[PDB]
Design a protein around this ligand. Sequence first.
Ligand SMILES: CCCCCCCCCCCCCCCCCC(=O)O[C@@H](COC(=O)CCCCCCCCCCCCCCC)COP(=O)(O)OCC[N+](C)(C)C
Ligand SMILES: CCCCCCCCCCCC(=O)SCCNC(=O)CCNC(=O)[C@H](O)C(C)(C)COP(=O)(O)O
Lengths: 109, 51, 615, 27, 247, 47, 70, 76, 84, 66
Amino acid sequence: AAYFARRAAQKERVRILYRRALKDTLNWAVHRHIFYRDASDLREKFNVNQDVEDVDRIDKLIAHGEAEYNKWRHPDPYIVPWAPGGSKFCRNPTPPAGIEIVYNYGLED
Amino acid sequence: GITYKGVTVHTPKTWHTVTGKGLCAVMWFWILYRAKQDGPVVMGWRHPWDG
Amino acid sequence: MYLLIVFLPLLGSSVAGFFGRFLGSEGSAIMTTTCVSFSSILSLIAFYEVALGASACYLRIAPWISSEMFDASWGFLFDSLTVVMLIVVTFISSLVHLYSISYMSEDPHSPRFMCYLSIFTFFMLMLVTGDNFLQLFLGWEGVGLASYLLIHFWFTRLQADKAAIKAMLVNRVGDFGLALGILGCFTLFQTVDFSTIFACASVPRNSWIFCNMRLNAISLICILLFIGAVGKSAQIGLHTWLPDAMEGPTPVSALIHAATMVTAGVFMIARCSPLFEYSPTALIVITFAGAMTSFLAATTGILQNDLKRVIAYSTCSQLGYMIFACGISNYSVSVFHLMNHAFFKALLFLSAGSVIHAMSDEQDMRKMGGLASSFPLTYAMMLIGSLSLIGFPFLTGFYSKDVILELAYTKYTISGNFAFWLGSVSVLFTSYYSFRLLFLTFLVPTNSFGRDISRCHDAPIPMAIPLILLALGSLFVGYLAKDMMIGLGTNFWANSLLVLPKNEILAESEFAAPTIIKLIPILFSTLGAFVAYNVNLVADQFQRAFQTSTFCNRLYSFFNKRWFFDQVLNDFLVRSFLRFGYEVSFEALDKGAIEILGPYGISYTFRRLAERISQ
Amino acid sequence: RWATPGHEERPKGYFMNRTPPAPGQSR
Amino acid sequence: SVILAGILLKFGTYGFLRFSIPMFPEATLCFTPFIYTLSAIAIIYTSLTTLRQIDLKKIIAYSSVAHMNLVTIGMFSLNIQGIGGSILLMLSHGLVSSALFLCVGVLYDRHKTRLVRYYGGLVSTMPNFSTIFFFFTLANMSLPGTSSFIGEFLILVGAFQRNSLVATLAALGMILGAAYSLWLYNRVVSGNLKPDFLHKFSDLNGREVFIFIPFLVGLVWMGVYPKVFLDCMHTSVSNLVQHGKFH
Amino acid sequence: PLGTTGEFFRRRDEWRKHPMLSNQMRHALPGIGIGVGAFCVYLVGEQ
Amino acid sequence: GGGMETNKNKFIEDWGSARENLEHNFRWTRRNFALIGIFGIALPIIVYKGIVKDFHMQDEDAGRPHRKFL
Amino acid sequence: GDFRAKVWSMTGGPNCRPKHWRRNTAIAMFGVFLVCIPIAKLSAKLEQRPHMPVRPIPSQIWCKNFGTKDDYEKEH
Amino acid sequence: DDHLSREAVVDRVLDVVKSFPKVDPSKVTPEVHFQNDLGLDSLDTVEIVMAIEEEFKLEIPDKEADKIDSCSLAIEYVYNHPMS
Amino acid sequence: KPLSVNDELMADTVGKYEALAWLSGGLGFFVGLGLLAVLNDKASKVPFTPRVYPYDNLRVELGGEP
Ligand SMILES: CCCCCCCCCCCCCCCCCC(=O)O[C@@H](COC(=O)CCCCCCCCCCCCCCC)COP(=O)(O)OCC[N+](C)(C)C
Ligand SMILES: CCCCCCCCCCCC(=O)SCCNC(=O)CCNC(=O)[C@H](O)C(C)(C)COP(=O)(O)O
């Protein structure tokens, strides 16, 4: 089970870390002309560590990578305006369905 | 509307470009005209008539 | 004709909010725009008649509160100071109303937005045209209510509601300070009217007993009033509400927070000048607070990436400038800079909103660039606004900020030097972030997405007429009004503003100082522009320092997160008070402690006592 | 936008949430 | 609840005005700091405990204790601003508070619940109720142009003349009063709807619209022209201010 | 433009070189030429 | 679903009942004793001393002797 | 949505656009004009100008309290 | 103001995946697997998903961002999303 | 999932005390600048004598004894 789950879960954590690091790198380097070299170096950080095959040393590397990312992360990331946490989120939302309004609620007899 | 690679940029109407250029030109001409009148005063080269 | 100036916005709001179902999204806009525009033209005749004709009008309708001597009637006072605020507030309100006709073209609930704008304008007019301290307070708190209503105009959002409630809490502390000041005014002079208080503001030289302390009567009142001014104008003590209040619509930002309701504190200080002049201790506090606010906003606004938030810190810096310009006991220059800023900051907000609306509501400068060719008009307009803001020579922002700085230089006192230093550094910082905003949004290579560029449309007619009018204002109004307001020996203000002969340094501000001092703002602006260009347009982008230096990252976080005010103030005051509400007052004082010694906690021993009577 | 007649013939929702009475009758 | 808060809470203050403040002028002066101490902490404690309540009728019921303890500061000030301004607060409170319990009664009759958690987004389904509820929210938080502000401010100017410290402590009452009053309105009225909990709505009927009308008229009429009520009392409250005094 | 990641992202941004978006420093100062020309005409004509 | 009555939740209802049945939740620990003996026994004394001293200092400023507030 | 068309609000609701908003708009102006007449007439009566204007101002056409309070020693 | 058709989505997504240096654009079917039909590195799948994200201006939550491992799934995700 | 008892009130890279220390340093910058302004003593370096007004510093026109 470890050969399919205990090792493959790290193969997904590394994808998550790469995604978050790439987004943060684009956030820090505002201009697109500068983001290219930064992203290339960022992947070179991962691409050099592909030589490992034993779990005894990779796991602490992932822990250290998460620790590093958690402290160089951008204080104010970029969020799409209509995405959750954005500026346009819940501006004019579609009203919920199934809600009905009754008439003549309080009428004597 | 000009398409380079899929994306297109709608060309602005003549009214907007003309108005923007006119306002910018008015600002520059006003700045230079004021610099002609009381430019020496702020530089301290000459008082209006104080001395 | 003068009651029409105040009540046309009220009638427009009362029509567009009560009968908006019959007028729709167009009739409700027409009613409010027409009413506010007619009020604006009436304010123009009021300026031609009172300020230029030198004949003030005093109008009392009916008594409001009539105690033994607590008389605060329904009085309106139109003098030189009031009329300037009228022609600013109502003109900006009419332009914002015209702007919102095209801005709120697809929003469903447009009529309620215009009703809120009209009621806000009505409250601001009641504020500025206030004869008493209570009508002034009436407007002073109605303006806060209107701002709160407009901030969460999109009630579905959660951030809007949080920002609105924070704004209300800060304005409530300010209102508490103002109420204490008003109570102090009545205890001394036994009146709240401005004429009697300003006439008798020199005789009292006694001391009070305030909160187990013996203080000066006038100084305490002036400090308490300045607390309210700080609350409303977003000064050093209470300013966190203003940057967060940008969650509202852009026209709300342009009127509610740029031109008006932030200048309410400055207007109240300038109007109460015949009282603040006799408390020299309060002027030191005002100067210190203004200098601190200007420098702090300038430092905070240089690293923001949100387009709307950068401009809010510019407004905070300008308000700080006005505040410590009032602190040098030069109120004419303060009102002059107020009127100047109400043009090139409303223009900045309107142009930024025009950019945002066309960019599918994209507010991040990191995701816009190369918009100069696509948006010619709005780029030119923001260029004009930024050049006025930084204080470009021979422009609206040059005739007031430079005068304020040179006046601060010639105030040879301990408080004046501090203000001069902070206001000098703030010029460099203001130039830096203004030019960064101009560069990133318009001149850098494009960083936006394909969809935003494809759906682009410049400002249509209803969103361009107010822009063009504000551009003409920000070009010429400063020069036109330079002579009448900050001239030597001018009688334009008449009795509106009082400056004692002892603390009058306007003449020495012009010819008593080296010409270098008169050129410091220009040199600092040029330095800031050069720094912004060299860090944005062309640079190796050494941001790797921000990724390798721990101090640099924390330093970047310090300026970005509003000097760690919101985080620290929340945890140490708001969370503490929330715990103080439940864990003690509700949990121990009245939960069971009264119960256990009350009627059933231990008093139910009668069950263990009545049953024993069988013995 | 400023010339086209509106679509909502009568305001949405009844006033006080009461259905209008029978035609030719009164509340 | 309208009877209990509208009138039954006005017996204590009326009893003080009629049988205590005059029959013992000397005893009232000696116990003035005692009443100021109890009322100052009651305003602070109750307006703070209100924030951590979850029942709709248990929040407004805590908005009366702070308001009614602000009245006893006014009565014991023993001046025209204090005693005269304390009467307007009770008339205002008798209308503002009793109108708020009508608003809660409207919500309870339709949806048999009172927890604030179940309520939200009513601004989109009950707009007339939201407009009426907001107006009495403004009155409860001492807004000028409402009958509460006239009484609230007249009490403050009546106590500042006697003790600046007690007028300072009582002034934080409107700081906290404006906190929960709007924060309750944001929860109940503003926000998103919750169709999982409750989905059927009905705005105010003919009775509810008509019932709130005298409260709306009688709250601004006292709030913009309180001279009608004030001039009927000054001859009677001035003889109350001095009884043992002869100078 | 260096590395497999940089090459990919650079190749995706080939639309950013659109003529209306490529160079904007040429339009940094909109009406400087017309303003300077009008001012020169005014200056020469006065004498 | 032809009823306006709320679909009450067990978690919310139980939480509200627990928050309203807090009368029987004291254990008389040192935290409660210290809390009720400080913020219920000392703050009123501090406030009362504040008003009494304010009256005393008002009295001495006018030259009148202190008033016996007891 | 589907249910917001069954909710009556004074403001009008989302995207309100009555068929006869042109006629209603014209009536609303006339109503505002009619209520503004007594306000203007009231204002011209209770307004006081202690100082004569430098130049003939338009308010001298209707207002009559110009230079009246100059004898402030006998004010009530 | 009208959501683009599915084939229009297919054009843009296939253009994005085609414009990659490591891939071979000889055969790029809408029904392909990144780690089974094109033979790429595990990491560069994240880059392609991102480039799809800004290309349509949509933010995929990080949880199922890595779930997109085939061109078929990507098209379906960027189609059933209404705000795109 | 029973609700929490305090279920009515609900800058991640910093802690409350660390950010308070940063704020204290930022405000100490202002305090130190104020102390420097005091140390400068600009009052003794004024280049002009205090302005003197006629008619005994405008005593009558400022509300003085006639
Ligand atoms: C009391 C002194 C201060 C007075 C200040 C007045 C400021 C306004 C106070 C009330 C504002 C309304 C806020 C509560 C209701 C929240 C919004 C609402 O639902 O109101 C309705 C009703 O419209 C109104 O807001 C009417 C109230 C404001 C208009 C009346 C104000 C008249 C002028 C103010 C008072 C005049 C004197 C003020 C000076 C003393 C509008 O609904 P819609 O915009 O169509 O969208 C809702 C969605 N759905 C349609 C689906 C339900
Ligand atoms: C804000 C900060 C920015 C980011 C800063 C840097 C953060 C991370 C720093 C540390 C990064 C590392 O070295 S650690 C992350 C990677 N470490 C390794 O050891 C890679 C070993 N290879 C594998 O795990 C698999 O092969 C796999 C990669 C799944 C390929 O899947 P395939 O089996 O199909 O080929």
